C-alpha cells in the first residue's frame, strides 16, 4: 500500500551506468519535480545513487499521484569530478505517471561525456 | 546558408533518427530557447525536421554567442502520429555553447516509444 | 568459489530490456561461445531469458577461466514473434574474460527493430 | 562513387562517432563479409574510416545482391590508440539485405570504452 514520502512499493526508481568505466555511476545527484496547478515545476523528491548506482525511497503509492514529473540528472558534476569537461549541463527525463491507474516506473540512463540515453520499464502493480 | 542574425551557417544543426522503422523521423517539431540573467528560457529559434529528418538554418555565427542552450523536442506528437503510446512528454538536451568561443555543433536524436539516446558532434571554428 | 558448469558468484550475467513495449524482453534466447585453442568458436553455454529479462547461472567460477567469449542474443526470433520484421539477424557481444585475474560480468543490451545497444559492468569479486 | 562489380553508387555506408571525445571516429578499420552456402564467412570489402567518420563506396548496386552480411569493426585498435582499455574485442552488425530486393543502407555506430550502440537507416530503391 501507499506510505507517504518514502518508499511504497518502490514506485520510482533510478539506475545510472558509467559506460567510460564499465560500472555503475555512483554518488550521482538528482531532483525530482512534479508540475503544479499553476504550471510551474515544484521540488518532490531528491537523492544521490548508491554504490550500486541505484536510488531507492524516493516516494511512497500514497504521495506519487498522477502528474507531469521530471528527473533532473546532475550528469556534469560527475563528469568533472572525474577530469572530464562533459557536454551537457545534466540530463532530463520528462514523463506522464500513473494517468490509468498505479504503475511501477524503472528510468535506467547510460553515460558518456557527449552522449547519453535513457530507458523506462513500466510495471502494472504486484504479484 | 545565408545569415545576418539567426538563421544559416550552420554552427547548430539537429538530425532525428526513428529506432522503429528504420528511417529519418520526419515533421518533428522543435524549439530552442536560451538562458537568460533571470534564469527563464528565452525563445530562440524552431522548426520541424525535413525529410531527411534534419533541421538547418536554426541560427547564424554572429548571433550564436556563448550561453546555455535547451533543444526541446516533440516526440510524443511523432508517436501519437502513427498510433503507438510513447512514454516520454518531450526530449530534452542543455549544454553549454562556444567555450573556444565561436564553434560548430550536431546534436543527432535516436527515438524509440519507451527509449531516447543522443549524442553531441562539435567541430571546429575553435583553432 | 568456483563450481563447475552452473553459477558461482555469479561470475556471467546478461540482461535484456524492449525499448518499444518498455519492458524486460522475455524468452529470448542466447548461446555462449569460447574461443578454442584451435581458433573456432565452441558452445559453451546457453538459456532463455525469465519474466524479469535476466540470464543467470550460465557458469561458475571455476569453469569460467581465461579466454575470448562471444555471447549470440537471438533478436530476430523475438520480434518476429511480435509481428515486426527487424534489421539484425541477432547482438553479438564479443570479449576477452579475466586475464587480469576472475571478475563478474554483467551484460546489458537495449533492443528495438532496426537498433541496439549493449554495455558492460564489470567488478572485482565479493565483498 | 563509379561502379561496377563493386564499390560507389553507394547501397552501403558506415558512420562511426566516439562518444567520449565528441567527434567522428577516424581511421577505424572494418571488414565486410558474406555468408556462403557452407555458413562460413567470405571475404567482400574493407576499408577505414575518413576524418568525418564515414566509409563510402564499399560496394556497387551490381554486386550487392540479396544475402547475409557481417561488418566486423576495429574498435580496440581504435580506443587502444588513444590509451584506453576497452571492453569489447570489436562490434558486429550483422543483417539480411535487399527483401525488395536491392536497397541503400546506412549503418551507424557510436562506441564508448564499455559500450557500442548501433543504427540502420534503409532507403527506398524498392518501390
Redesign the interface.
Known amino acids: 500500500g501507499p506510505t507517504g514520502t518514502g518508499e511504497s512499493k518502490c514506485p520510482l526508481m533510478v539506475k545510472v551506468?558509467?559506460?567510460?568505466?564499465?560500472?555503475?555511476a555512483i554518488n550521482v545527484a538528482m531532483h525530482v519535480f512534479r508540475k503544479a496547478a499553476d504550471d510551474t515545476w515544484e521540488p518532490f523528491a531528491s537523492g544521490k545513487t548508491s554504490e550500486s548506482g541505484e536510488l531507492h525511497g524516493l516516494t511512497t503509492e500514497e504521495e506519487f499521484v498522477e502528474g507531469?514529473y521530471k528527473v533532473e540528472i546532475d550528469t556534469k558534476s560527475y563528469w568533472k569530478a572525474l577530469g572530464i569537461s562533459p557536454?551537457?549541463?545534466?540530463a532530463?527525463?520528462?514523463?506522464?505517471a500513473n494517468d490509468s491507474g498505479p504503475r511501477r516506473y524503472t528510468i535506467?540512463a547510460?553515460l558518456?561525456?557527449?552522449?547519453?540515453?535513457?530507458?523506462?520499464?513500466?510495471?502494472n502493480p504486484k504479484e
Chains 1, 2, 3, 4 share one sequence.
Open positions: 551506468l558509467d559506460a567510460v568505466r564499465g560500472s555503475p507531469i557536454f551537457h549541463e545534466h532530463e527525463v520528462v514523463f506522464t535506467a547510460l558518456s561525456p557527449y552522449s547519453y540515453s535513457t530507458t523506462a520499464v513500466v510495471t
